[PDB]
Scaffold this active site. Structure first.
Site, short mmCIF file in Angstrom:
data_model
loop_
_atom_site.label_atom_id
_atom_site.label_comp_id
_atom_site.label_asym_id
_atom_site.label_seq_id
_atom_site.Cartn_x
_atom_site.Cartn_y
_atom_site.Cartn_z
N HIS B 65 -43.98 -60.04 -41.38
CA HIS B 65 -42.58 -60.14 -41.74
C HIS B 65 -41.71 -60.27 -40.50
O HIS B 65 -40.86 -61.15 -40.43
CB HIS B 65 -42.14 -58.94 -42.54
CG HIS B 65 -40.66 -58.76 -42.58
ND1 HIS B 65 -39.84 -59.53 -43.37
CD2 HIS B 65 -39.85 -57.89 -41.93
CE1 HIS B 65 -38.58 -59.15 -43.20
NE2 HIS B 65 -38.57 -58.15 -42.33
N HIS B 113 -37.21 -55.42 -35.00
CA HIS B 113 -36.17 -54.92 -35.90
C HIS B 113 -36.72 -53.79 -36.77
O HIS B 113 -35.96 -53.01 -37.35
CB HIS B 113 -35.57 -56.06 -36.75
CG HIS B 113 -36.31 -56.37 -38.03
ND1 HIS B 113 -37.39 -57.23 -38.08
CD2 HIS B 113 -36.07 -55.99 -39.31
CE1 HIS B 113 -37.80 -57.33 -39.33
NE2 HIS B 113 -37.02 -56.59 -40.09
N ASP B 114 -38.05 -53.68 -36.82
CA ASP B 114 -38.69 -52.71 -37.69
C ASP B 114 -39.45 -51.66 -36.93
O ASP B 114 -40.09 -50.79 -37.51
CB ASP B 114 -39.62 -53.41 -38.67
CG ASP B 114 -39.26 -53.11 -40.10
OD1 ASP B 114 -38.48 -52.16 -40.34
OD2 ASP B 114 -39.74 -53.84 -40.99
N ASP B 264 -33.26 -61.48 -40.91
CA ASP B 264 -33.91 -60.47 -41.74
C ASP B 264 -33.61 -60.72 -43.21
O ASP B 264 -34.55 -60.88 -44.00
CB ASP B 264 -33.46 -59.07 -41.33
CG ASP B 264 -34.45 -57.99 -41.71
OD1 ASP B 264 -34.03 -56.82 -41.79
OD2 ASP B 264 -35.64 -58.31 -41.93
N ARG B 429 -53.47 -25.26 -31.95
CA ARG B 429 -54.19 -26.50 -32.30
C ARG B 429 -53.28 -27.56 -32.93
O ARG B 429 -53.39 -28.77 -32.64
CB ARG B 429 -55.35 -26.14 -33.21
CG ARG B 429 -56.17 -25.10 -32.53
CD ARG B 429 -57.31 -24.59 -33.31
NE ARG B 429 -58.39 -24.25 -32.39
CZ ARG B 429 -58.43 -23.14 -31.67
NH1 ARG B 429 -57.46 -22.25 -31.79
NH2 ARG B 429 -59.46 -22.93 -30.84
NI NI Z 1 -36.93 -56.60 -42.15
#
Ligand code: NI
Ligand code: NI
Lengths: 494, 492
Positions: B65, B113-114, B264, B429
């Site tokens: 994408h 962008h993601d 987008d 831990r």
């Molecule tokens: Ni997007």
């Protein structure tokens, strides 16, 4: 001769071609159309899950991310070449002054598609397919005069005595089908299967080798390098001929931008494989540095690798080290590659140049060989990698055996199956057939319909195209899809 | 008063390039940026975060994408530059020696962008915020100190009489409950990965301009740019320096961003439809009818109906090829034209609209795709189930690491310093399981603090929560799911 890149960067298409005079802009828009076609093709996303080196399990490279990295390096080499040409006042003279954008883009996209043809599990998918079709077709028994116990199990393709024209066709078919190769399958995929209808120039940058798959015997001395592997199949033969005409290629000659792509692949391949190796905790960074220092022997290593190491010792260390290893490597090799391309431009332009930009005894090539050595000795030999290769080979062999009964059928019967879709006395092979991708079946119907229906060549060509179909379907799968199909059809999972 | 030399800034935060540079040297700098990004682990991690469908290969991932968006951004950028050249405005706007950079910054802003989004996307978001709300209750810090302040953290509870500390408490509680992909993206590129991009490049990631700690209504004149949080309380200093380097007014935005945003919108709508058909939800004809119905020489005729006519190679592929092509051939020019037409405001960074968000036919086409998608795809029980599951997984991980946030300052500090604490086996831990990058970011930020100041416990707790959110949001879908399963002792 003369170097006129307008004669190579050909913005025509095979179908519905652009015609006539075009603005520099209109040309650019055409090659951008190519970019769109490629970036949006399913083939590329399918890359986002074929394995590169490691099992998918996220930070490890896949065929896609690797291809993007190669694309970036290709861009950088292209830009360096163009820029040096501008500094040499040679840009106009070579016809590149209105084709800089196209030049760059064709290289970039050729990079992005350089793996498009590889089957699931890569070189082991290859292995599986070829080995299987060898056990069924035995091309080795068609080398010379007809053998009286010809080991080939296909009646039509067995060498018959006295019929030497048909025998030659049989010969080529049997050899071709046993030489499935990523790149050849790539040409086939872009043209016949996906019907992307790219520009001639763009298709040209995918044609990485120039040996026909049906080639038997030794390769010419003067072309040894360009004919290392098969480059196109017996089917794409016509197409490849038209391609040669459109790109002004002599026989077995190659498109130039290819040399560029190739170099990019070499660089990215080496460095990345090492970084991923460290990421999978095989060895630490220091361990890697020592393996490199040892396997070497003001030199190049000092600059690239030792400076990367010294930078690394003063963000996270693995990341710093590999950032500067990549950067230094590129700052040494990319200029060299550019320089080699230009220095050898006449031969490369002709498409006859019998060397890689990097393949040398030059220090640069030795650096690359160093990365490759550390990789093959300490990474590709790791038991988890090897196991995955073994497994992949079993999965592809398995699928091939599962669909065997499609290739078992007689011409009459299989044809009946194609035409009626669902045959009553053939439940299994009917459903097996339906499972083949409509794209691939369509390609089969298309190719067979174009044949002289009554000619004695016909049964042969049909069988060829049918095997071609099955290989299309298998090689088209992603690793996980192939594995999953194998498991479901073996009724191991539901 | 548009000088893009004043926006396309090739300096870096650290080890910056200095002095006079060739057009070439500038180009090489922005190419160095491309290299840094394409080779970052963040991007490959995208090659397996879910886009819409469960990973199962032809379906989009965050990466593919992002590549599609990158292509559309490149086309929009080229159209803008080309239109500006035809208007003889290129020199006047200072873009004549920055065309390459312009293009490239857009492309890479698209690709990243993601980058910030957490596993399971907006449901990871949901999970994180909802969990930190149940623990911090920012709603109770809106005004004067509440006497039964529901917040469970002693230090952050509003105390009576101490209004400076109370304001800090207020901002922290609000900020921590407003984790957002983009803000986390800024944080990730700068503080976590330490990529040291150019200022211009970082600027194209800053998509919203509202501070995460913002409480109350947004200004009328900035409503659109402050829809969502854009940066956290931590990156505050950084964002200030960014504003100075890119000549941004307060709450103003970088321009190339508007471009990325448009890209987008487009590729997201069309692609989601194509994938919908690929997963055999509906056939192509079914899709065409849903579109025709949900519409009402117009645009639809051109783009969609011509795509359908051409469609009648494989039909799904032909139809979607020409749907994509026609859509782009209509919207990309429009986006370019909008960018140029509004260039003064966009340059200032104050422009209160998207390139596409309109009552314009174009926006309506996009809304059409989005409508068919949301009604017939995102409502498909398998998508919804995955969202539910993702929310459970992230909520689960947060609960699993809760005891790290339960510790007192004294104790947690002891844990950081001694690495393995004897009386604290579990949280030791748990702590080791946090990524070294994130832990490093915590140590780094805390060490820079006034050790004796009364603000310190507050800031430390903030940075600790910040740490845990960094770790969770950093995961891929599959990794987070797998960690949840193993730590629940459901699988080995
Ligand atoms: Ni997007
Ligand atoms: Ni490769």
């Amino acid at each position: 001769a003369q170097i006129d890149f307008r004669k190579k960067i050909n913005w025509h298409r095979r179908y519905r071609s652009p015609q006539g005079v075009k603005t520099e802009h209109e040309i650019l828009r055409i090659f951008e159309s190519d970019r769109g076609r490629i970036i949006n093709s399913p083939a590329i996303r399918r890359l986002q899950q074929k394995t590169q080196v490691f099992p998918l399990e996220a930070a490890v490279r896949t065929r896609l991310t690797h291809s993007m990295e190669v694309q970036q390096v290709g861009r950088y080499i292209a830009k360096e070449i163009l820029s040096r040409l501008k500094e040499l006042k040679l840009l106009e003279a070579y016809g590149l002054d209105e084709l800089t954008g196209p030049f760059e883009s064709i290289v970039e996209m050729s990079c992005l598609m350089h793996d498009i043809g590889n089957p699931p599990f890569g070189h082991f998918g290859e292995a599986a397919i070829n080995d299987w079709f060898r056990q069924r077709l035995h091309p080795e028994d068609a080398e010379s005069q007809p053998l009286t116990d010809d080991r080939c199990s296909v009646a039509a393709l067995r060498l018959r005595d006295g019929e030497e024209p048909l025998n030659e066709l049989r010969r080529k078919i049997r050899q071709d089908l046993c030489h499935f190769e990523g790149n050849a399958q790539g040409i086939r995929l872009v043209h016949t299967l996906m019907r992307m209808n790219l520009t001639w120039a763009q298709v040209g940058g995918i044609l990485k080798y120039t040996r026909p798959a049906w080639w038997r015997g030794e390769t010419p001395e003067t072309h040894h390098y360009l004919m290392k592997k098969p480059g196109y199949y017996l089917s794409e033969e016509a197409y490849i001929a038209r391609l040669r005409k459109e790109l002004n290629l002599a026989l077995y000659s190659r498109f130039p931008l290819t040399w560029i792509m190739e170099a990019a692949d070499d660089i990215s391949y080496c460095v990345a494989d090492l970084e991923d190796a460290v990421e999978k905790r095989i060895f630490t960074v220091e361990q890697l540095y020592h393996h490199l220092h040892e396997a070497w022997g003001g030199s190049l290593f000092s600059l690239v690798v030792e400076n990367a190491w010294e930078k690394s010792r003063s963000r996270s260390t693995e990341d710093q080290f590999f950032m500067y290893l990549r950067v230094n490597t590129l700052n040494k090799l990319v200029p060299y590659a550019a320089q080699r391309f230009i220095d050898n431009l006449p031969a490369i332009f002709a498409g006859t140049f019998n060397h890689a930009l990097l393949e040398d005894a030059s220090e640069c090539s030795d650096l690359l060989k160093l990365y490759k050595n550390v990789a093959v000795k300490h990474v590709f030999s790791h038991p988890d990698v090897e196991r995955l290769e073994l497994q992949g080979y079993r999965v592809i062999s398995g699928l091939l055996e599962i669909y065997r009964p499609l290739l078992s059928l007689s011409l009459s019967d299989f044809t009946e199956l194609v035409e009626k879709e669902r045959v009553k006395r053939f439940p299994i092979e009917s459903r097996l057939f339906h499972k083949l991708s409509t794209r691939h079946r369509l390609a089969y119907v298309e190719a067979v319909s174009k044949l002289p229906s009554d000619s004695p060549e016909f049964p042969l060509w049909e069988y060829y195209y049918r095997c071609r179909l099955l290989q299309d379907y298998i090689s088209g799968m992603t690793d996980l899809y192939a594995w999953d199909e194998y498991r479901r059809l073996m009724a191991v999972e539901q």
